[PDB]
Amino acid sequence: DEYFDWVWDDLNKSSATLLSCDNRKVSFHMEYSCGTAAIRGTKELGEGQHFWEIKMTSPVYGTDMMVGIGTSDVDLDKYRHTFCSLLGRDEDSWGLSYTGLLHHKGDKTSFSSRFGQGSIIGVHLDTWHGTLTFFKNRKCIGVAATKLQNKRFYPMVCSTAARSSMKVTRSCASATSLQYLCCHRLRQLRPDSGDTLEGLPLPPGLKQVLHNKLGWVLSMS
Amino acid sequence: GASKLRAVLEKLKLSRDDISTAAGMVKGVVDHLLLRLKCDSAFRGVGLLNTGSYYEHVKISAPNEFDVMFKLEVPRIQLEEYSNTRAYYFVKFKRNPKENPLSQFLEGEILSASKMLSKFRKIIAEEINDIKDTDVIMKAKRGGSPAVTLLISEKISVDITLALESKSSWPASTQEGLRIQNWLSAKVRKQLRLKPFYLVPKHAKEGNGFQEETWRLSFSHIEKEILNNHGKSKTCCENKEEKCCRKDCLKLMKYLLEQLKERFKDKAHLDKFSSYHVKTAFFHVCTQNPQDSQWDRKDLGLCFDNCVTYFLQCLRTEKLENYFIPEFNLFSSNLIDKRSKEFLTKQIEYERNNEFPVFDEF
Amino acid sequence: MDGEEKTYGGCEGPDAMYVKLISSDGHEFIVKREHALTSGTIKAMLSGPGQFAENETNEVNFREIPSHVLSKVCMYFTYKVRYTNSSTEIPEFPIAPEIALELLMAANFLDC
Amino acid sequence: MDVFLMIRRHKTTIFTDAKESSTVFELKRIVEGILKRPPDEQRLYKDDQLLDDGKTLGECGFTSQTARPQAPATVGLAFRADDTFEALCIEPFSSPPELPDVMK
Ligand SMILES: [Zn+2]
């Protein structure tokens, strides 16, 4: 895969987590687990476009394990000694729980089905129009948030299972261009087929670069 | 991690046979007590509520502390509420021809459970010395309902309780309970709705004192009956392929609750919780999910978690409704302190998030 | 705002504020200076020698781009120059899907 | 406040962002600033109907509602043919290709 674009912040993480494999794998509570533990990303998403998906490796359990986005105004170690959902508790953060429910602004909205060990979850972000999209097991679930203009964000994950970890496998970014918007429009006009290159004689090089840029768009509907 | 749950299940299973080996001693003792009571005039009609299963066991890891419940049929009575509790009742004898089981306990206009238990103790003490092939000692009181405690030699201990019975129709206070219609269809609901109900004695207490003479509805036989015939159809678990794991998920939770109390026995702050609360929550859960397809042997995991999540949410919201009296709130602040409630929430969540560390000591 | 003076009426020389774009079919679209500089090819070619003179004709002809494609290019240019870093909610860019199926070749042909 | 509009004549097809309170004569002034054609020589129309130079675009039916970001309203422009109305020199755009069935 193409080199990932950000790591979990070495200087910004809760007082109970260890990081490994060039920080690609983050591990939560290798002993007592007596509170919530959380981390942020290093790169800011306020400009351009972004996309990344996270692969799970450990059995799921506990109060809540959630993947989402938020600002830097939220504190990490405020729940160092308490079991709680940190993501989505305030208007400045969002979160999707493994139980198939979404947290935002301190409320709960059921969004999708549950997932656990071995599952792959994908998130698509479009800051220019301020819309956010979630993907699961290389399938489309649906749009979750919109009207997020002028706001700056970092990616966060929160955990509460001991003996458990999460692992970012791919991280890339791109700028707004015709290779973004026109191909999204084409996929909206070609949702039935799994592949979109069929019937298109366009050069293989631009084909491969548009894979590396928006592979899900050509392979998702 | 269902491997640990299956392993502890087998470990609990392997000690099943030792009960019947020692059951003969207690069988003989309760038989001698039964004949002794039957020669008396006060309790000429006392019988056995579970013939063929003549013992009841409350603790899942206490093969030496038996429990037995004697039934005592009563022909015709009238009941009334106490200060609008909707779970505690009085009793009265309304009209009968010349047939008096025992009216000498009638004081004022209430049959006296205090005198009931007072004579009940005296009969047991005057009888117990008659046994000569086994040393038996009768131990002090521990509660309103288990007013008698019987200890055999040193190991076997039994507490005896008594209950009344009546064939009259169930009162209107339980009209909305037992929402089984979606689970086992209304036909079974209607036929079990005419089986008798049992009134056990239980004192009422307040800040300025305690009011001793009060009764309470009991449904242990029906509670066992649904669990015995849990299947949506007659054929559930009748073949090796269709087995369902409804039964194990309750004995699992009893063991957890007993273990937590054992580990925190010093401060005694968790001594107000029993297995009744565990059983009620599981019954609510299975009413919520009546389909048999949700209880396959493979998973066990989502069902145990649903049980613990339901109990946790009930504990947080301070709401727990009795399965037969839908208005009764056992978790109300009148009975259980919020301090102990939050203590138990903290402990249960810690165990859930640490993957039940207490089960590893076994 | 009205009656802009600029002390000469413009800066059509080294700071050419209007440049002229002719399509293959003859359709003519004007763009402001930063609109022209947005496309890499236009800003690269405008940097050529002699093009900074006052009398140079600020004209570019696209013999390979028809009217509709050039119109959509100008549309995107105006959109991005006006609501760049927009504080208010940014409106969508909906084109009819029977007419916008070909805009892919515009990106790599014009380097925009 | 500015409104997104567009002005077209023959080859020319020019977008504009004049303020709503501006006048049609101000549109002529802008066209003069762009292509050195004096306001007097210019003539503006809507659809194919005559218009007055003193009227404002607000009363000419062009407002922010017509200023949709996806489609600014079109304003007709004409250059005086010596002394009279010039002919319809507008040239239609190229035909669009037919979409195949598998995108249908
Ligand atoms: Zn079954």
Author numbering:
A (entry chain B): 100 to 320
B (entry chain A): 161 to 522
C (entry chain C): 1 to 112
D (entry chain D): 1 to 104
Excerpt from the paper describing this PDB structure:
Cyclic GMP-AMP synthase (cGAS) senses aberrant DNA during infection, cancer and inflammatory disease, and initiates potent innate immune responses through the synthesis of 2′3′-cyclic GMP-AMP (cGAMP). A cryo-electron microscopy structure of nucleosome-bound cGAS in a complex with SPSB3 reveals a highly conserved Asn-Asn (NN) minimal degron motif at the C terminus of cGAS that directs SPSB3 recruitment, ubiquitylation and cGAS protein stability. SPRY-domain- and SOCS-box-containing (SPSB) proteins bind—through their SOCS box—to the elongin B–elongin C (ELOBC) heterodimeric adaptor connecting to the CUL5–RBX2 complex and recruit substrates through the SPRY domain specifying protein ubiquitylation.
A 3.5 Å final reconstruction of this complex reveals an intermolecular interface contributed by the C-terminal helix on cGAS (amino acids 497–515) and five variable loops extending from the bent β-sandwich core of SPSB3 opposite face of the SOCS box domain. Moreover, a set of acidic residues on cGAS, including Asp465, Glu509, Tyr510, Arg512 and Glu515, bridges to residues Thr162, Tyr197 and Arg213 on SPSB3 through electrostatic interactions reinforcing complex formation. Although the overall composition of the substrate-recognition module—comprising the connecting loops extruding from the central SPRY domain29—is identical across SPSB paralogues, the residues involved in side-chain contacts to the substrate are unique to SPSB3, reflecting its specific role in cGAS binding. Notably, cGAS single substitutions of either asparagine residue of the predicted interface (Asn513, Asn514) disrupted all detectable binding to SPSB3, demonstrating that the conserved NN motif on cGAS is the main contributor to SPSB3 recognition. Single point mutations of the supporting cGAS residues (Asp465, Glu509, Tyr510, Arg512), but not the adjacent position (Glu515), weakened the interaction with SPSB3, and a combined mutation of all four cGAS residues completely blocked binding, therefore confirming their importance in reinforcing complex formation. Likewise, a combined substitution of cGAS-interacting residues on SPSB3 (Tyr160, Thr162, Thr259, Arg262) abrogated cGAS binding.
